[PDB]
Swiss-Prot record:
The modification S-nitrosocysteine is found at residues 75, 143. GO terms for biological process: defense response to bacterium; defense response to virus; integrin-mediated signaling pathway; ISG15-protein conjugation; modification-dependent protein catabolic process; negative regulation of protein ubiquitination; negative regulation of type I interferon-mediated signaling pathway; negative regulation of viral genome replication. Its main location: cytoplasm. InterPro entries: Ubiquilin, Ubiquitin-like_dom, Ubiquitin-like_domsf. GO terms for cellular component: cytoplasm; extracellular region. It is found in: Cytoplasm; Secreted. GO terms for molecular function: integrin binding; protein tag activity. Pfam families: ubiquitin (PF00240). The lineage of its organism: Eukaryota, Metazoa, Chordata, Craniata, Vertebrata. This is Ubiquitin-like protein ISG15. The keyword Disulfide bond applies. PROSITE patterns: UBIQUITIN_2. Homodimer; disulfide-linked. Interacts with, and is conjugated to its targets by the UBE1L (E1 enzyme) and UBE2E2 (E2 enzyme). Interacts with NEDD4. Interacts with PARP12; this interaction inhibits PINK1/Parkin-dependent mitophagy. S-nitrosylation decreases its dimerization, thereby increasing the availability as well as the solubility of monomeric ISG15 for its conjugation to cellular proteins. Induced as an inactive, precursor protein that is cleaved by specific proteases to expose the C-terminal diglycine (LRLRGG) motif. This motif is essential not only for its conjugation to substrates but also for its recognition by the relevant processing proteases. The gene is Isg15.
Length: 149
């Protein structure tokens, strides 16, 4: 393991312990532990190129000498998820990970003609709480959220 310099735009610089085979996705998690920015609010760039979460640091030509930029996003960007209901059908919903679980239940509510208090949502077996942000449950593009009656 070796250390990498991270510079936050309009922010502080700092280092993180990293590996060559480590992914940008894991790096963001290291950054979150260091400065508390949730991974889903982090956009990383190296030399004006925005980094894809699946890329490995070595594949990107990173070493102890490199420096990566961090841009923190107050409001995040849209992604699609699947919400599979009691009937077993999955429909596409659009969310921002910085939105609350609540905004999603309201979308489900309006669209599927049900009251918010008549169902609840889970992701990977974990129940989703109305006031928490969707990102905190590790939602990713086309992941499946389950709707329970």
């Amino acid at each position: 393991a070796w250390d990498l310099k991270v510079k936050m735009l309009g922010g502080n610089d700092f280092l993180v312990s990293v590996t060559n085979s480590m992914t940008v996705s894991e790096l963001k998690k290291q950054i979150a532990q260091k400065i508390g920015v949730p991974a889903f609010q982090q956009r990383l760039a190296h030399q004006t190129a925005v980094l894809q979460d699946g890329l490995t640091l070595s594949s990107l030509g990173l070493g102890p000498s490199s420096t990566v930029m961090l841009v923190v996003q107050n409001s995040s960007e849209p992604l699609s998820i699947l919400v599979r209901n009691e009937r077993g059908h999955s429909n596409i919903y659009e969310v921002f990970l910085t939105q609350t679980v609540d905004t999603l239940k309201k979308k489900v509510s309006q669209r599927e003609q049900v009251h918010e208090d008549q169902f609840w949502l889970s992701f990977e077996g974990r129940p989703m709480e109305d006031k928490e942000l969707l990102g905190e449950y590790g939602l990713k593009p086309q992941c499946t959220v389950i709707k329970h009656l």
